[PDB]
């Protein structure tokens, strides 16, 4: 493919967007300006991402291209790449490509980015044996047989219909693999990939992780959203620094106890009641423990370097172990049974404090936390100890704002009334309970929320 | 504005190696206990130029970076996360999110 006469740029590159780009690249003034093959031969790289290109007709004449970026365009047909055999790197993520047959003979490729396209058939990749980076996620691939001969691969991803990982067996050069959001249950083949450093396998159907035992070079592992329970194998992976096991069925954390390089650990939405095994994990800066079965969180006081912690949706009454965590910047503990927040006055670095759906009645200990930027205190609830029924029963309002002022009830049950500080009923007959609600917008520092709740008063 | 958002701080080293896209943090709204939540992001680097440097998986809330970053070119990005129901109704107030590009 060679221009034999001076040709207007827009007669070579028929796409409007590509003609405009080429005009600039070739140092011309108008898209109608003429160029020769000697001009086109000088183009060895092209960064043409994000330009709304629909067609690369004309690229076949850029015979000396070695690196191209056509990512984030509207490409469908990629036929003009067929004979550009000097190409070593293609960025072509986020297009509408289905047919990759034009890539079949680009044997000098070392990098090929094709994620977020409409690819099913990857058979045209089978001879691209020089590839070391290949990205195929967010496509509709089910069969990865074409990958079996790609023995220089170091970085790989694919999706989203793969169940059979057998074609990976000989790709022992693999260092970084992402198999998230496929239909994978059987990861036995991964035991062959002893050079793996990073393995991302979120949103699959994995329950057996014994194949990972000998993958001791792993420093990063994500098994978020599978069917894990027995994590005994993880004790072997002493180089782990980042571990994501959220959205599983894990209860026994003992295998994690020696993983002392861990700086990030995600364990939310599991079946954990015992966190004593986490006690020695002092390099942790991020820990997620939400949606478990926690009550005694005392072992957490050891984790002095935490800056991010989640504890929401548990059975915690006593929050004071977190008060040791002086570096905390973001703390989430909604949906527990905490009433006394006075120990949190010690969290002088806190920015985000999420504590809705607890039993908090008094904001005063929080008054000096002026660096707060995000705050949640909505929908508290508690039940008072029973008091004796009597027709003129009265209880004090205990609900106190950060200013120290009582917050007047929003509503009071059974036609009851309020005169600071007392809520008083006038009951005609015995009733088993009375109640009140409160709802008060409040800001602490720059963090705004509605401090609200419902208070139940049983009557004996 | 916090509402039921649960969001970790976001930082990405420059010159990261693939495979891309790379998971950064998983964003969540605790509104997901009462119905399906769908996530989206807006902002420079998301839906405006440079478009799609950052993306979010609408069902999982996985925020991802799609290409290497360069701190000297752009050192920070300001995005906004959105959380809606299956019926298009916001279940959270949009949350401004800072992305810091590190060493
Ligand atoms: Ca190679
Ligand atoms: Ca730089
Ligand atoms: Cl260029
Ligand atoms: Cl989680």
Residues of chain A contacting residue B66, judged by C-beta atoms under 8 Å apart? 71, 93-94, 115
- Could you tell me the fold of the domain covering A380-460? Immunoglobulin-like (2.60.40)
| E strand map for A161-251 | 176-178, 198-200, 220-222, 242-244
Cα(A412)–Cα(A419) distance, rounded to whole angstroms? Answer: 12
| E strand map for A65-211 | 67-69, 89-91, 111-113, 133-141, 155-160, 176-178, 198-200
Q: What is the resolution of this structure in A?
A: 1.9
Ligand 4 center from residue A387 Cα (angstroms) = 41
Residues of chain B contacting residue A91, judged by C-beta atoms under 8 Å apart? 67
Please name the residue of chain A whose CA is at the shortest distance from the CA of residue B5. Answer: A354
Contact status, residue B46 vs residue B97, Cβ threshold 8 Å: no
Q: Measuring CA to CA, which residue among A312, A284, A317, A280 is closest to residue A299?
A: A280
Give the residue from B12, B27, B28, B30 with the most A CB atoms within 10 Å of its CB, the best one to mutate.
Answer: B30
Count: domains in chain B: 1
Backbone angles phi, psi at B54, to 5 degrees: -110, 140
- Considering only CB atoms, A200 lies closest to which of B23, B50, B51, namely B23
Question: Which ligand minimizes its atom distance to the CA of A43?
Answer: 3
How many Å is the Cα radius of gyration of chain B? 14
Q: Give DSSP secondary structure letters for A333-375.
A: --SS-----GGGGG-TT--EEE--SS---B-GGGTT-TT--EE
- Method of determination is X-ray
Q: Measuring CA to CA, which residue among A112, A149, A107 is closest to residue A128?
A: A107
CATH of the domain at B14: 2.60.40.60
Number of residues written out for chain B: 103
Cα(A256)–Cα(A253) distance, rounded to whole angstroms? Answer: 6
- Considering only CB atoms, B19 lies closest to which of A176, A335, A448, namely A176
**Which one is the CATH code of A1-379: 3.40.50.300, 1.20.1050.10, 3.80.10.10, 2.40.128.90?**
3.80.10.10
Backbone angles phi, psi at A155, to 5 degrees: -130, 125
Give domain limits for chain A. Answer: 1-379, 380-460
Q: Distance of CA A179 to CAs A162, A165, A279, A412, Å?
A: 9, 9, 32, 56
* B1 vs A: CB within 8 A: yes
Q: In what order do the strands lie in the sheet with A411-412?
A: A380-383, A447-458, A433-444, A411-412
Cα(A130)–Cα(A111) distance, rounded to whole angstroms? Answer: 9
Domain that holds residue B14: 1-103
Cα(A191)–Cα(A206) distance, rounded to whole angstroms? Answer: 14
> Between chains, do B62 and A449 touch, taking CB under 8 Å as contact?
no
Q: What distance lies between CA B90 and its chain's CA centroid? A: 16
**Nearest-CA distance B38 → chain A (Å):** 16
Element of type H or E holding B96: strand B95-102
Contact status, residue A325 vs residue A304, Cβ threshold 8 Å: yes
């Amino acid at each position: 493919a060679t221009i034999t006469q001076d040709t207007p740029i827009n007669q070579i590159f028929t796409d409007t967007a590509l003609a405009e780009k080429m005009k600039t690249v070739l140092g011309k003034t108008n898209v109608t300006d003429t160029v020769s093959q000697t001009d086109l031969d000088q183009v060895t790289t092209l960064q043409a991402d994000r330009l709304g290109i629909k067609s690369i007709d004309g690229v076949e004449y850029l015979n000396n291209l070695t690196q191209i970026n056509f990512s984030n365009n509207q490409l469908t047909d990629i036929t003009p790449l067929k004979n550009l055999t000097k190409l070593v790197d293609i960025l072509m993520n986020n297009n509408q490509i289905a047919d990759i047959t034009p890539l079949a003979n680009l044997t000098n490729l070392t990098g090929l980015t094709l994620f977020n396209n409409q690819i099913t058939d990857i058979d045209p990749l089978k001879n691209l044996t020089n590839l070391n980076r290949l990205e195929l996620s967010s496509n509709t691939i089910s069969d990865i047989s074409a990958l079996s001969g790609l023995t220089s691969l170091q970085q790989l991803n694919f999706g989203n219909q793969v169940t059979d990982l057998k074609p990976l067996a000989n790709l022992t050069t693999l260092e970084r693999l992402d198999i998230s959001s496929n239909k994978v249950s059987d990861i036995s083949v991964l035991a062959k990939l002893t050079n793996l450093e990073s393995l991302i396998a979120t949103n699959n159907q994995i329950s057996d992780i014994t194949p990972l035992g000998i993958l001791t070079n792993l420093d990063e592992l994500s098994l978020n959203g599978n069917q894990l329970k027995d994590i005994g194998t993880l004790a072997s992976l002493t180089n782990l620094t980042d571990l994501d096991l959220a959205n599983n069925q894990i209860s026994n954390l003992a295998p994690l106890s020696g993983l002392t390089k861990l700086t990030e650990l995600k364990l939310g939405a599991n079946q954990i009641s015992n966190i004593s095994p986490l006690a020695g994990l002092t390099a942790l800066t991020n820990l997620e423990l939400n949606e478990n079965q926690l009550e005694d969180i005392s072992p957490i006081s050891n984790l002095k370097n935490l800056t991010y912690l989640t504890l929401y949706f548990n059975n915690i009454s006593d929050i004071s172990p977190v008060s040791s965590l002086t570096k905390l910047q973001r703390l989430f503990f909604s949906n527990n049974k905490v009433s006394d927040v006075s120990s949190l006055a010690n969290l002088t670095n806190i920015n985000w404090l999420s504590a809705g759906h607890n039993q908090i009645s008094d904001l005063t200990p929080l008054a000096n936390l002026t660096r707060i930027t995000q705050l949640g205190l909505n929908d508290q609830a508690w039940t008072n100890a029973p008091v004796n029924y009597k027709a003129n029963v009265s209880i004090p309002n205990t609900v106190k704002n950060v200013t120290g002022a009582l917050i007047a009830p929003a509503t009071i049950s059974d036609g009851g009334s309020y005169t600071e500080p007392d809520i008083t009923w006038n009951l005609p007959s015995y009733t088993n309970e009375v109640s009140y609600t409160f709802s008060q917008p409040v800001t602490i520092g720059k963090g705004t929320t509605t401090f609200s709740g419902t208070v139940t008063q049983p009557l004996k | 504005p916090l509402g039921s958002w649960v969001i970790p701080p976001i930082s990405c080293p420059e010159n990261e190696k693939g495979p891309f896209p790379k998971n950064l943090v998983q964003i969540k709204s605790n509104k997901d206990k009462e119905g399906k939540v769908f996530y989206s992001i807006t902002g420079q680097g998301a839906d405006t130029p440079p478009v799609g440097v950052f993306i979010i998986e609408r069902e999982t809330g996985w925020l991802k970076v799609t290409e290497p970053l360069d701190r000297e070119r752009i050192a920070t990005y300001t995005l906004f996360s959105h959380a809606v129901s299956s019926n298009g109704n916001a279940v959270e107030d949009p949350m401004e999110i800072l992305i810091t590009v590190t060493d």
